[PDB]
């Protein structure tokens, strides 16, 4: 329901601050180890239900909402395993999810010029604007967690943190939810490259600021795995600075 720029500001700006707040509360105010249980089941439920619900949606904004819920579950995996690596994986996941959400909402705002509503309106978009189609496909794959992109690194290190604490069920549920999650992402892909509808919707060209932000984020997503050291070092310093 909310306007597109509002939803763009939401799910990035609020979630980062609230997650930092939860980190501060969890690390200090929680010593009974009772928040492991509440984060465990809720993150598992978020993973499962986001993966199983985003596949049944036909609009775009609902799909982004359920993808956000799924990524919230993926990030919350880090709370259950309370270690330096767990918080590191959590923060890295937040960073990557924020970049991918900015890119995806830039895509959505780009097609908002002609009032895109459903997922079928972006049919045969590889013909009218091939390069925007490539950018959207890359961002969708980054959401999926395909290796040669950012977003795979975040899920990777979240799984590493989950396995470090011995929460073997968290790793398995993460894997299966990722498997289903990639399916409807590729389903989004098919309607946007392969099958061509009879009626084509024409989108007017974009402006420079959105295009520049989109290009920067797209080059960050693809080439992240080449040089990921600065993010990892920032995150390791941040995780340790909670105490010293």
Partner 1 sequence: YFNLSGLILCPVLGSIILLFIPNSRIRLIRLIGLCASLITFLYSLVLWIQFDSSTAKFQFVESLRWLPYENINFYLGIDGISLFFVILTTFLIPICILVGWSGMRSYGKEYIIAFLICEFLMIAVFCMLDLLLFYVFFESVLIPMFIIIGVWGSRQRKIKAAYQFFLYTLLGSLFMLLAILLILFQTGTTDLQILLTTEFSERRQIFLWIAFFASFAVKVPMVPVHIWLPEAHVEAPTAGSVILAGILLKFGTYGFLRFSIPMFPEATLCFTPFIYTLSAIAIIYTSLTTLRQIDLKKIIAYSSVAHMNLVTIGMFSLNIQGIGGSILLMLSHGLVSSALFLCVGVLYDRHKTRLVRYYGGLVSTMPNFSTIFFFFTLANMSLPGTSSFIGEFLILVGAFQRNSLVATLAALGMILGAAYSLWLYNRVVSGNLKPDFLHKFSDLNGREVFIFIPFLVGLVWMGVYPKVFLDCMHTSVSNLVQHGKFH
Partner 2 sequence: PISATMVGALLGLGTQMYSNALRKLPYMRHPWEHVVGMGLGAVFANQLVKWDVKLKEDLDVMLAKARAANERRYF
Partner 3 sequence: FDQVLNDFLVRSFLRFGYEVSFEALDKGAIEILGPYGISYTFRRLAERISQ
Ligand X SMILES: CCCCCCCCCCCCCCCCCCCC(=O)O[C@H](COC(=O)CCCCCCCCCCCCCC)COP(=O)(O)OCCN
Ligand Y SMILES: CCCCCCCCCCC(CCCCCCCCCC)(CO[C@H]1O[C@@H](CO)[C@H](O[C@@H]2O[C@@H](CO)[C@H](O)[C@@H](O)[C@@H]2O)[C@@H](O)[C@@H]1O)CO[C@H]1O[C@@H](CO)[C@H](O[C@@H]2O[C@@H](CO)[C@H](O)[C@@H](O)[C@@H]2O)[C@@H](O)[C@H]1O
Of the candidate spans 77-85, 149-157, 182-190, 224-232, the one that interacts with ligand Y by CB under 6 A turns out to be 224-232
User: x/- site string to ligand Y, residues 179 to 218, per CB under 6 A?
Assistant: ----------------------------------------
25 binds, among ligand X, partner 3, ligand Y, none (CB under 5 to 8 A by kind): none
User: x/- site string to partner 2, residues 121 to 140, per CB under 8 A?
Assistant: --------x-xx--x-----
Pick the closer one to partner 2 by CB: 43 or 217: 217
CA–CA dist 155, 47 (Å, integer)? 12
Half-sphere exposure of 232 (CA within 13 A, CB side): 13
4 binds, among ligand Y, partner 2, ligand X, none (CB under 5 to 8 A by kind): none
160 binds, among ligand X, partner 1, partner 3, none (CB under 5 to 8 A by kind): partner 1
CA–CA dist 73, 42 (Å, integer)? 8
Does 172 help bind ligand X (rule: CB under 6 A)? no
Candidate residues 41, 183, 194, 200; the one interacting with partner 3 per rule CB under 8 A: 183
Pick the closer one to ligand X by CB: 9 or 219: 219
- Among candidates 130, 99, 105, which has minimal Cα distance to 224? 99
Does 175 help bind ligand Y (rule: CB under 6 A)? no
Q: How far is the CB of 195 from partner 3 (least distance, A)?
A: 18
Candidate residues 229, 241, 243, 244; the one interacting with ligand Y per rule CB under 6 A: 229
Name the packing angle between helices 61-80 and 168-193 (round to 10°): 160
Q: How far is the CB of 197 from partner 1 (least distance, A)?
A: 14
178 within 8 A of 46, measured Cβ to Cβ? no
Pick the closer one to partner 2 by CB: 52 or 84: 84
CA 162, 224, 9, 140 torsion-angle sign: negative
CA–CA dist 104, 54 (Å, integer)? 15
148 within 8 A of 55, measured Cβ to Cβ? no
**Tokens 């309607």 — which residue?**
191
Contacts (CB under 8 A) with partner 2, residues 194-223: 205-208, 211-212, 214-216, 218-219, 223
176 within 8 A of 49, measured Cβ to Cβ? no
236 binds, among partner 3, ligand Y, partner 2, none (CB under 5 to 8 A by kind): partner 2
Pick the closer one to ligand Y by CB: 164 or 228: 228
Distance from CA of residue 135 to its chain's centroid?
A: 15
CA–CA dist 142, 148 (Å, integer)? 9
172 within 8 A of 44, measured Cβ to Cβ? no
Give, in degrees to the nearest 5, the angle at Cα 51 between 47 and 56.
Answer: 150
210 binds, among partner 3, partner 1, ligand X, none (CB under 5 to 8 A by kind): none
């Amino acid at each position: 329901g909310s306007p597109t720029p509002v939803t763009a500001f939401l799910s990035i700006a609020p979630k980062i601050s609230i997650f930092a707040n939860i980190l501060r509360v969890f690390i200090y105010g929680s010593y009974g180890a009772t928040l492991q249980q509440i984060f465990f089941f809720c993150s598992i439920a978020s993973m499962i239900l986001g993966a199983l619900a985003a596949m049944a949606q036909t609009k775009v904004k609902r799909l982004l909402a359920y993808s956000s819920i799924g990524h919230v579950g993926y990030i919350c995996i880090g709370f259950s395993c309370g270690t330096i690596e767990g918080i590191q994986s959590l923060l890295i996941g937040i960073f990557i999810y924020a970049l991918m959400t900015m890119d995806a909402f830039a895509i959505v705002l780009a097609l908002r010029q002609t009032r895109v509503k459903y997922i079928a309106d972006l049919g045969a978009l590889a013909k009218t604007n091939p390069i925007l189609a490539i950018t959207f496909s890359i961002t969708m794959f980054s959401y999926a967690g395909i290796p040669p992109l950012a977003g795979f690194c975040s899920k990777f290190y979240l799984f590493f943190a989950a396995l470090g604490c011995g929460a073997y069920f968290l790793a398995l549920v993460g894997v299966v939810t990722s498997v289903i999650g990639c399916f409807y992402y590729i389903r989004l892909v098919k309607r946007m490259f392969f099958d061509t509808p009879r009626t084509w919707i024409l989108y007017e060209p974009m402006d420079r600021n959105k295009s520049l932000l989109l290009a920067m984020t797209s080059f960050f997503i693809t080439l992240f795995l080449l040089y990921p050291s600065p993010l990892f070092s920032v995150t390791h310093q941040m995780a340790l600075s909670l105490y010293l």
